């Protein structure tokens, strides 16, 4: 139970939803469960508001950018961060709502001596790399940890989200692909998603990260 408020960028740390828009869970800390809810894209306070309530955060590709939570993030889950396209720009409840999602970056779970080694559930901050080869343009980041404590069940997988406003500037000429929606990317179906994370079926093969493959230039 956490959320993700403060954006990270040139080196320092944003205030609480300085550069994030501010997630229902804001006083509950609680997850999104359904990801057929459009509250799997951004978690927002109020969809028609929250945006404008949120500053625009201006970064240069291939800087270094990422989210600090409201606390550690103490539960053993899959993080990854999808950018988006922003338009007309990073504060608008248009941003992101078409299949332009694609994903820049994740830290899974890794199998190792049979069981499943996750990230460091000590850790209140993550970052990752805006890439070099990204147009320059504002896009709208969404950062998630989909924690799998409970995840044995469908919908048992717990999804603590923030997305920040990004302003990129001095970027490439890549092509970022591929492209998927939020709601869309994810069924609930995933084996990494529907996953009893203590009890591993007999022949699995390791942790599969859900969503598509990262784009990186
Ligand atoms: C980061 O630094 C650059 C260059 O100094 C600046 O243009 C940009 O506004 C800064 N972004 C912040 C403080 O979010
Ligand atoms: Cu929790």
């Known amino acids: 139970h956490y959320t993700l408020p403060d954006l990270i960028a040139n080196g320092t740390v944003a205030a609480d939803w300085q550069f994030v828009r501010e997630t229902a869970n804001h006083y509950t800390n609680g997850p999104v469960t359904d990801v ?21 955060a201006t970064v240069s590709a291939g800087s270094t950018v990422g989210m600090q939570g409201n606390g550690a993030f103490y539960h053993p889950g899959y993080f990854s961060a999808y950018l988006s396209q922003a338009s007309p720009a990073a504060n608008s409840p248009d941003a992101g709502t078409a299949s332009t999602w694609f994903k820049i970056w994740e830290d899974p779970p890794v199998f190792e001596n049979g069981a499943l080694v996750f990230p460091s559930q000590s850790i209140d901050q993550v970052t990752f790399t805006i890439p070099k080869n990204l147009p320059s343009g504002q896009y709208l980041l969404r950062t998630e940890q989909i924690a799998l404590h409970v995840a044995s069940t469908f919908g048992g997988a717990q999804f603590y989200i923030g997305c920040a406003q990004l302003n990129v500037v001095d970027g490439g000429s890549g092509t970022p692909g591929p492209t998927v929606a939020f709601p869309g990317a994810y069924t609930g179906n995933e084996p990494g998603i529907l996953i009893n994370i203590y009890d591993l079926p007999a022949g699995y093969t390791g942790y599969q990260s859900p969503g598509p493959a990262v784009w990186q230039g």
Not at 38 to 53: K, N
């Open 36 to 56: 057929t809810d459009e509250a799997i894209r951004c978690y927002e306070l109020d969809y028609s508001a929250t945006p404008g309530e949120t500053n625009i």
